Amino acid sequence: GILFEDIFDVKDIDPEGKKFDRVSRLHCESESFKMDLILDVNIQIYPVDLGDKFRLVIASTLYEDGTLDDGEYNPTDDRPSRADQFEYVMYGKVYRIEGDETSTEAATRLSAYVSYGGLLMRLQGDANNLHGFEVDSRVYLLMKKL
C-alpha cells in the first residue's frame, strides 16, 4: 500500500526564519532520486539535526497486507503487525497537487502538499513516481532515522 519510499538527508533545519515552538521545518533532498522534501516535524518528540539521514515512506494503509483502513482510531487494535519498523509515524491528507511551472519544457514534475493536522509537507519531483497521490486522499508518513 506504499505510495512512495526513499532515503533522505537533512540539508537545512529552518531557512524561512519563521520559528514555531515545538515544530521544526526540515528542508531535505532525496538520494538517487533528487526529489525534494519540506517537512514540519514535531522535534520535542523526535529530535532531528542537520546532516542526518532517515528512511521515509508514504502509505495509504499501515497493515502492509492490502486491507484498507477504516478511518477510526483504536489504540486497542489486535492486528499489531502494522508498520512499526518506523520510529515517527504521522497521518494527514493531501490537499494540493500542482504540476510545475515550466511551460515549453517537459517540466512533468509535481509538488504534492500534505497536511498532518497543522504540520505541512511538500514532496516535489518526477511525476512518474508521484502518481499514487490525489487531492483529499489520506496518507501516513512513516519515518525512521539511520
Binding site: 497537487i97 500542482e98 504540476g99 509535481l110 490525489e134 487531492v135 483529499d136
Partner: protein, 229 residues
C-alpha cells in the same frame, strides 16, 4: 467636548433624513415607490439585489461557490429549482446585445441611417459636387448627398436603418428579473463570462477532479442572483 457636540448634531441630521425617506418600500413590481405611489426608482439598487445578499456575488468569491457547489445546491436551490428554470427569453436578449456590441465597438459614434449613407463621401467629393456654393448654408457637396439619398433610393429596401439601430434595452428593464430566469444585470453577466473563461482554463491544468461544468456553474450563479432580490 467634541464627542458631545458631534452627537448633538448627528442626532438632528439623522432625524431629518429618517423623517423624509421613511415611506419608500419595494413594491410587488420591484419598483421603489413612496406612500402616494410616486415612482422614485424603477429598480431598487438600479438592479434590485438588496445589500446583505450581494456579498458573495462579487467575483473573487466564485472560486468559493464553485468549491462548495454540492453543498450550495443541496442546502438551498437544490436540483428542483435548477431544472424548473427556463432561460430562453433572457438568454436571447443577451445574445442580441452581444451581437450589437460586436458590430459597434465604439458606442459613441453617432449612429444614423443617413449618416450610414455617407460612404459615397468619396463618390461625391470626386467630381459630382465640384460646382456650387452654400445654397441654404449646408454645402455644395452636401446637397448632392441629400438629393441621392432623399428620393433617388429604394422605396422600402433602402435599409441603412438596421445597420444603424439602438442597442437592445437592458434585460432587467424588459424581462422582470424576479420571474424570469437568467435575466441579470449587464455587469454581472460580464463578470460571469470572465470567470467562466478563467475557470475553464484552470480545470485543464488542475490535478484535482472537478465534477462541475462551466454551464452548471453558470446556472448556479444565475440562481444565486435571482434569489438575492
Amino acid at each position: 467636548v467634541d464627542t458631545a457636540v458631534k452627537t448633538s448634531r448627528s442626532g438632528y441630521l439623522q432625524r431629518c433624513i429618517i423623517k423624509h425617506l421613511e415611506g419608500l418600500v419595494v413594491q410587488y413590481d420591484l419598483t421603489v415607490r413612496d406612500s402616494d405611489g410616486s415612482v422614485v426608482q424603477f429598480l431598487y439598487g438600479e438592479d434590485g439585489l438588496d445589500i446583505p445578499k450581494t456579498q458573495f456575488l462579487q467575483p473573487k468569491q466564485f472560486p468559493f461557490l464553485a468549491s462548495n457547489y454540492e453543498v450550495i445546491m443541496k442546502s438551498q436551490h437544490l436540483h428542483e429549482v435548477l431544472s424548473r428554470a427556463d432561460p430562453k427569453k433572457a438568454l436571447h436578449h443577451f445574445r442580441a446585445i452581444k451581437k450589437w456590441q460586436s458590430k459597434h465597438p465604439n458606442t459613441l459614434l453617432r449612429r444614423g441611417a443617413f449618416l450610414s449613407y455617407s460612404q459615397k463621401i468619396q463618390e461625391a467629393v470626386k467630381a459630382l459636387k465640384l460646382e456650387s456654393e452654400n445654397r441654404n448654408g449646408r454645402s455644395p457637396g452636401t446637397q448632392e448627398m441629400l438629393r441621392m439619398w432623399y428620393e433617388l433610393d429604394e422605396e422600402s429596401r433602402r435599409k441603412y436603418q438596421k445597420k444603424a439601430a439602438a442597442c437592445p434595452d437592458p434585460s432587467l428593464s424588459v424581462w422582470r428579473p424576479d420571474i424570469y430566469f437568467a435575466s441579470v444585470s449587464e455587469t454581472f453577466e460580464t463578470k460571469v463570462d470572465d470567470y467562466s473563461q478563467e475557470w475553464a482554463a484552470q480545470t485543464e491544468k488542475s490535478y484535482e477532479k472537478s465534477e462541475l461544468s462551466l454551464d452548471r456553474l453558470r446556472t448556479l450563479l444565475q440562481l444565486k442572483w435571482q434569489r438575492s432580490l
